Design a protein around this ligand. Structure first.
Ligand SMILES: [Mg+2]
Ligand SMILES: [Mg+2]
Ligand SMILES: [Mg+2]
Ligand SMILES: [Mg+2]
Ligand SMILES: [Mg+2]
Ligand SMILES: [Mg+2]
Ligand SMILES: [Mg+2]
Ligand SMILES: [Mg+2]
Ligand SMILES: [Mg+2]
Ligand SMILES: [Mg+2]
Ligand SMILES: [Mg+2]
Ligand SMILES: [Zn+2]
Lengths: 159, 148, 211, 287, 152, 108, 285
RNA sequence: ACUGAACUCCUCACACCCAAUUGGACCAAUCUAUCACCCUAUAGAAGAACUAAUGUUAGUAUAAGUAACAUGAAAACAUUCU
């Protein structure tokens, strides 16, 4: 057992200066010992990894898997503590920065050993609009990269 | 091995031989136990050799700290802000003298792999080879199968 | 659960018989559940005798000076979060009420000169002395966050504060500590907040309606 | 100078926003009850002359930001980025409402103004372009219009297909920029200060400041382009999905100068039409 | 290869699929609205409308009374099929049922459906409405219809 | 047969993280206009359907009270009535299921 | 979100758009009925060694057809439904050995095509066809793009090759698919016969006699069996079989033109050996 | 003629490429004696060193989220039907 992710909401930053950009909020939440496997949660956790919380909620209400409901409870809970506890003004203005799933303390049942599998779920929400997705690189980017690799090369193994 | 280790090119610190030569070793910091069997050769080094050494190069400032250590060290600091900490643990005076002169003689650059054994900054004098050295020109700059 | 009745009814339905056991040690309280006589703001030399018969070296003419230093110093213990001094300066009815909500955020309270002299108002009374004081001051606040961004009050600008601070003393080793702070019902609203709030309506299950 | 026009107009605009926010009583906080069909009876406790209906939508969800377009503030149509003024009541109006009249009108006014933003910066510099107005065309009538007076050089000019196509390409360049529509309710003196170099828009400001009991006049800014509207507008340029400048017509009773009207048709990202339906809506938008 | 195979194979045989469908049809004649899984519902929808077409053949018809006797496992519903449902639909010739999808079943995540019989006393379903005729696109197309009517 | 070697996490990660095994972001999802809870297109709103389900549940309970015992399907059409509503002239010759709440906004 | 054409239309506007778009499809099919009163391309006579256009036809089904020798011939019907020439590409732009005509059949909804296709058919002036097949063709046969091809492009007696997707049987094993059931070779050769997806592939039946064409309903009555299910689209070209490479003398060479109005055709052309219905019952005397 | 080695030369350094076997020089950590006192020294001792015994125990992989397993139906959850 380690429990470092719960403590991450207790970092206190020194107050800022007027000539300094506003730091976005960061809300670390998790659930432990979910009775589900860590590699079935990987798909649900992977699904929502840059989405706004409204898009994440909306995608998990219509998913048929067992873990979707659990993650939806974790995200509604973290939206609550986002606003109440951590000074986020808009409920809507969050996005999922981190969503992973580790393994939990499993049990062993003798039938012939069979593991009762548990998992956790870790989410960091960050205040702000979700960052724009990475554009696919164009033929201009490929051509510049190639030519820059040609400009880069040296006479090798000499002076 | 070379693919595990970092590498660098052969360099100086501030063109160290061009104008004048500057000793790259600023500080030595000896720390020597008073009662302690490992810093015996350090003790006999402070008593015999460190004053002669300190006079043979005055650009180096030497600090002998003499606390109760369990392993004695020397800490060489260089002009480019590198720090080499070496132990003089259970060494004779002669071995410490060769180590301290070794630290004096070298510079602060890393003793990682050096790629080439040389470093010109002006490698070419007659002009570096491009594919139109050693080619004749044509009349009116024509190329093959050019009509006019 | 939400109360003791819910837990004892759940322990009766479950079968958890908790025997009330007799212990010779009890809890040695040094405070009071609230205020003896609620001083409602716009003859009690009885209780001054009932204080001087225990303390016997006590000048009220010097006390609102002392009540200033018990006040101000306590508030400076919020600037550093020094709880160990606050237990000397403030009561245990008053310690959570001033330090709980302020946790995980930095406050930068400061005092500047009083508009009026602080003056004692009333005094009441195993024995708990209790003295209410009127203070009319100028203070500064800046409550920041976990992330160090301002959520209450301009840092420089002083504001005029009325403070009906109630002190309390145990009557062996105790002293005068802030017990509470009466806020009158006529008092003006405080500073507004830098952020905006949505307040939800009733969350309706499908079987009910909004009216 | 045209660059001096846009610079001096935007500077007068920012003088009016700078005076507009300076007259705050330091974050007064007014509350607005969400009088609406769904998610009912939620008050928003908001900053007075700062927070807009868009921020109320942001308190609710991403859904009410993306789908809502006007706001019935006390039964009055309001922009999403117009700052609120007092304790009020908000509905949020979308395109797919039961009776979305004011949203069709707002969309229509918006597309005419975006068109004017394309027209002014379309011609090469030696040609005087002069935007008289955007008349209130019904949405059933086929196409949003914009009346423009052109230079005497282009008295006999009629654009080709490629010139209307170049107008649309500038319009999709104007959509892609994703520009909000700033608003300012300004009294008529500063309104006449900004447009002090166009007889037509001066007379328009005068006719509209004569309609309210104050001298109050709505100004809107897309990006570096100011115009006078009759009412509210769309929140952003990014809402217009399909957009075509379809035709140019010349009005007939034109003795002083040509009141040369432009035609266009457009649909939002919400009410996209299929390609064939869109072609028939192009055809009908050329009358 | 199942080209042109029109029947779902269900239950644990052909006989058992006809008894499953018969239980669903009995449920829907009794209650006039059913949640059941989707494939079972549209199979049974085919049977339900045919059953009313036998209900319109008259009470006195012998063949209709044989079909109703088979298909309705509760015998009190056979007066209902010949005096409530068949008189209700005596006007229209088809389309006696409506089917929609529910969200998926909580238990095993099955595609769910409702069929009801049209025009029943029960509270109405939240039917999927077309978009309003007063929207932007619908007003443009209304205007275009007005112009193509102006051609004559 | 049995596996000749043990597959590595590099091969495995390439197997169980390629897009054929990832969950597809679906975009059928709208907001129900009546309730504001987000529904899916082509599917009824879960919330509004739960409303209608609960009211058919009370109505069917009172059907069961007025019938009494099994095998009592009436040969008559039925009409649901709420508090303070006269049966209409159209509602004559129909059994009546009186309710105790108000007529809903959506029942008609 | 993605949309479809019907999504935002009211109840009032859905049959309006059906009648509108359907009526423009009928008008566009009706405008192309006069290719020669238009400005066609120069019509050349048949030269020995030239190729002409094919068709695209529905497979209607089969029926028997008795010849004068009293032998059955099972015959597929192939209706030509809205066949038209779509684009001509010369051999220079093709970089193939021969010029090509693109021809498409069976008008299909405009609400269900990619916009590049709808721009293509919009410029061409036609409602979009379901399939477009490409014909290798000489320069002499090149009808202008946008012209109707009819059933009487073929005539009875002509032999014909038909290509269509075969009826897909899905994943089948070895006994159905291939019809059966080394050590030192440590591997399975390419092209080994194994289970897999049977059918749903293009196959061509070569050299099929055309027995009878029906000019009114535009049916071709072809000998034997054609690949594909009923109501499938087939590509009907003249046969490449070298026993049938020279009989393009009597065939109308660019294509058959009813617009030419010269010696118009009956209801149904029959081959000489076909027992027509309505003929007296045949006797072998 | 040129290329071509760990051969030979060249600049500096040299105790620094065999099985089993056998000779030697050092030595990790531990405990004891006495030092030492941010981790050591001189000795004395010993359960004194593991990439390998289908080793022993425990953990966790892989095969694998695979094989396999499970709840007749509608409903008022009363009940009825198959
Ligand atoms: Mg089965
Ligand atoms: Mg091999
Ligand atoms: Mg050698
Ligand atoms: Mg050692
Ligand atoms: Mg051992
Ligand atoms: Mg080991
Ligand atoms: Mg083994
Ligand atoms: Mg081992
Ligand atoms: Mg396997
Ligand atoms: Mg299986
Ligand atoms: Mg079972
Ligand atoms: Zn709903």
């Amino acid at each position: 057992i380690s429990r470092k992710w719960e403590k991450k909401n207790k970092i206190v930053y020194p107050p800022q200066l007027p000539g300094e950009p506003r730091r976005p909020a960061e809300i670390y939440h998790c659930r432990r010992q979910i009775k589900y496997s860590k590699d079935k949660m990987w798909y649900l956790a992977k699904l929502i990894r840059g989405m706004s919380i409204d898009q994440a909620l909306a995608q998990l209400e219509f998913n048929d898997k067992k873990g979707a409901k659990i993650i939806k409870e974790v995200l509604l809970e973290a939206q609550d503590m986002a606003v109440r506890d951590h000074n986020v003004e808009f409920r809507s203005n969050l996005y999922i920065a981190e969503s992973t799933s580790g393994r939990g303390q499993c049990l062993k049942r003798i039938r012939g050993i069979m593991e009762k599998v548990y998992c956790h779920y870790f989410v960091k929400l960050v205040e702000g609009p979700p960052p724009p997705p990475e554009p696919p690189k164009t033929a201009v980017a490929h051509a510049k990269e190639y030519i820059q690799q040609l400009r880069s090369r040296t006479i090798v193994h000499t002076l | 091995t070379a693919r595990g280790t970092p590498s660098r090119f052969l360099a100086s610190v501030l063109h160290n031989g061009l104008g004048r030569y500057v000793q790259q070793l600023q500080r030595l910091s000896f720390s020597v136990s008073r009662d302690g069997a490992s810093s015996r050769g350090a003790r006999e080094f402070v008593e015999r050799e460190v004053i002669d050494f300190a006079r043979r190069n005055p650009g180096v400032v030497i600090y002998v700290n003499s606390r109760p250590c369990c392993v004695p060290r020397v800490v060489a600091e260089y002009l480019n802000g590198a720090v080499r900490e070496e132990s003089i643990h259970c060494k004779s005076v002669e071995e410490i003298s060769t180590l301290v002169q070794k630290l004096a003689d070298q510079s602060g650059l890393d003793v990682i792999r050096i790629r080439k054994p040389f470093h010109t900054d002006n490698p070419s004098i007659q002009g570096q080879w491009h594919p139109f050295t050693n080619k004749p020109t044509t009349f009116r700059g024509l190329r093959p199968r050019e009509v006019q | 659960f939400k109360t003791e009745k819910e837990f004892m009814q759940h322990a009766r339905k479950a079968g958890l018989v908790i025997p009330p056991e007799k212990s010779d040690r009890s809890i040695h309280l040094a405070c009071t559940a609230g205020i003896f006589d609620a001083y409602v703001p716009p003859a009690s030399q009885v209780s001054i005798r009932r204080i001087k018969d225990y303390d016997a070296n006590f000048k009220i003419k010097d006390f609102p000076e002392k009540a200033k230093d018990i006040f101000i110093e306590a508030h400076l213990c919020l600037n550093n979060s020094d709880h160990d001094r606050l237990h000397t300066l403030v009561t245990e009815h008053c310690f959570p009420d001033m330090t709980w909500d302020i946790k995980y955020k930095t406050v930068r309270w400061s005092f500047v000169e009083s508009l009026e002299p602080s003056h004692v108002v009333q005094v009441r009374c195993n024995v708990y002395g209790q003295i209410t004081v009127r203070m009319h001051t100028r203070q500064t606040l800046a409550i920041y966050d976990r992330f160090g961004r301002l959520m209450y009050g301009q840092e420089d600008v002083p504001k005029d504060v009325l403070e009906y601070v109630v002190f309390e003393k145990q009557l062996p080793y105790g002293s005068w500590r802030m017990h509470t702070k009466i806020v009158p019902p006529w008092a003006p609203p405080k500073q507004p907040i830098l952020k905006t709030v949505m307040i939800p309506g009733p969350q309706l299950k499908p079987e009910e309606e909004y009216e | 100078s045209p660059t001096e026009l846009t610079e001096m107009r935007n500077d007068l605009f920012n003088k009016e926003k700078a005076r507009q926010l300076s007259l705050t009583p330091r974050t007064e906080k007014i509350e607005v009850k969400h009088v609406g069909k769904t998610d009912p009876g939620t008050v928003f406790v908001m900053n007075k002359n700062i927070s807009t209906p868009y921020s109320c939508a942001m308190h609710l969800s991403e859904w009410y930001c993306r789908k809502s377009i006007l706001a019935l503030v006390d039964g009055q149509p309001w922009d999403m980025y117009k700052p609120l003024t007092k304790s009020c009541e908000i509905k949020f109006l979308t395109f797919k409402d039961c009776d979305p009249g004011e949203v069709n009108k707002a969309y229509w006014r918006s597309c005419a103004m975006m068109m004017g933003c394309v027209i002014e910066r379309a011609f090469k510099d030696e040609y005087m372009v002069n935007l008289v107005r955007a008349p209130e065309v019904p949405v059933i009538s086929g196409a949003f219009c914009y009346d423009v007076v052109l230079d005497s050089k282009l008295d006999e000019w009629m654009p080709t297909k490629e010139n209307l196509r170049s107008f649309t390409k500038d319009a999709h360049a104007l959509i892609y920029k994703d520009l909000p529509f700033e608003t300012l309710e300004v009294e008529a003196k500063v309104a006449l200060e900004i447009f002090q170099h166009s007889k037509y828009k001066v007379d328009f400001i005068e006719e509209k400041a004569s309609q309210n009991p104050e001298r109050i006049v709505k100004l809107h800014r897309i990006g570096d382009f100011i115009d006078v509207s009759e009412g509210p507008l769309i929140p952003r340029t990014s809402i217009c999905f399909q957009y075509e400048v379809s035709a140019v017509h010349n009005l007939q009773p034109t003795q002083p100068s040509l009141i040369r009207r432009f035609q266009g048709v457009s649909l939002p990202v919400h009410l996209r039409a299929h390609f064939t339906i869109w072609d028939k809506l192009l055809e009908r938008s050329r009358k | 290869i199942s080209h042109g195979r029109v029947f779902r194979r269900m239950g644990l045989g052909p006989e058992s699929r006809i008894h499953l469908l018969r239980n669903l049809l009995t449920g829907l004649v009794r209650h006039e609205r059913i949640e059941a899984p989707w494939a079972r519902v549209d199979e049974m929808r085919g049977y339900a409308e045919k059953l009313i077409d036998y209900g319109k053949l008259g009470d006195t018809n012998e063949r209709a009374m044989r079909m109703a006797d088979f298909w309705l496992t509760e015998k009190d519903l056979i007066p209902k099929l010949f005096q409530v449902l068949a008189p209700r639909y005596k006007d229209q010739t088809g389309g006696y049922t409506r089917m929609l999808q529910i969200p998926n079943r909580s238990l095993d995540r099955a595609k769910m459906a409702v069929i009801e019989y049209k025009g029943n006393c029960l509270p109405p379903l939240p039917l999927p409405r077309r978009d309003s005729h007063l929207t932007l696109l619908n007003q443009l197309l209304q205007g275009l219809r007005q112009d193509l009517r102006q051609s004559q | 047969a049995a596996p000749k070697n043990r597959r590595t996490i590099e091969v495995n990660r390439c197997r169980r993280r390629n897009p054929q095994k990832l969950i597809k972001v679906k975009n059928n999802i709208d907001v129900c206009p009546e309730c504001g809870h987000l529904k899916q297109k082509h599917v009824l709103c879960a919330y509004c359907y739960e409303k209608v389900c609960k009211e058919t549940a009370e109505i069917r309970r009172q059907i069961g009270k007025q019938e009494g015992g099994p095998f009592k399907a009436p040969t008559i059409e039925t009409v649901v009535l709420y508090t303070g509503e006269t049966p209409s002239e159209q509602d004559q010759g129909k059994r009546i299921i009186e309710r105790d709440r108000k007529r809903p906004s959506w029942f008609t | 979100s993605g949309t479809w054409w019907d999504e935002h239309l009211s109840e009032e506007n859905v049959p309006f758009i059906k009648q509108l778009v359907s009526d423009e499809d009928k008008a566009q099919l009706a405008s192309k009925l006069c290719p020669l009163k238009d400005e066609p391309w120069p019509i050349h006579p048949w030269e020995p060694g030239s190729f002409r256009v094919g068709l695209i036809a529905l497979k209607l089904g089969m029926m028997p057809l008795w010849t004068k020798d009293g032998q059955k011939h099972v015959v597929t019907l192939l209706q030509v439904q809205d066949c038209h020439v779509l684009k001509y590409t010369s051999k220079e732009n093709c970089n193939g050995k021969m010029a090509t005509l693109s021809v498409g059949g069976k008008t299909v909804s405009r609400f269900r095509k990619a916009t590049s296709i709808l721009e293509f058919y919009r410029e061409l002036g036609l409602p979009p066809k379901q399939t477009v097949k490409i014909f290798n063709i000489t320069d002499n046969a090149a009808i202008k793009p946008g012209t109707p091809l009819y059933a009487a492009h073929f005539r009875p007696g002509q032999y014909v090759d038909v290509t269509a997707k075969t009826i897909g049987k899905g994943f089948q094993g070895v006994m159905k698919r291939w019809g059966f059931k080394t050590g030192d070779i440590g591997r399975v050769w390419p092209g080994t016969k194994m289970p897999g997806k049977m059918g749903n592939i293009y196959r061509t039946e070569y050299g099929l006699k055309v027995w009878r064409i029906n000019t009114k309903h535009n049916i071709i009555y072809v000998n034997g069996s054609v690949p594909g299910h009923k109501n499938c689209l087939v590509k009907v070209k003249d046969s490449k079989l070298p026993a049938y490479k020279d009989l393009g003398k009597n065939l109308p060479f660019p294509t058959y033109f009813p617009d030419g109005d010269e010696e118009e055709l009956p209801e149904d052309l029959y081959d000489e050996n076909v027992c027509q219905p309505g003929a007296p019952s045949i006797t072998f005397a």
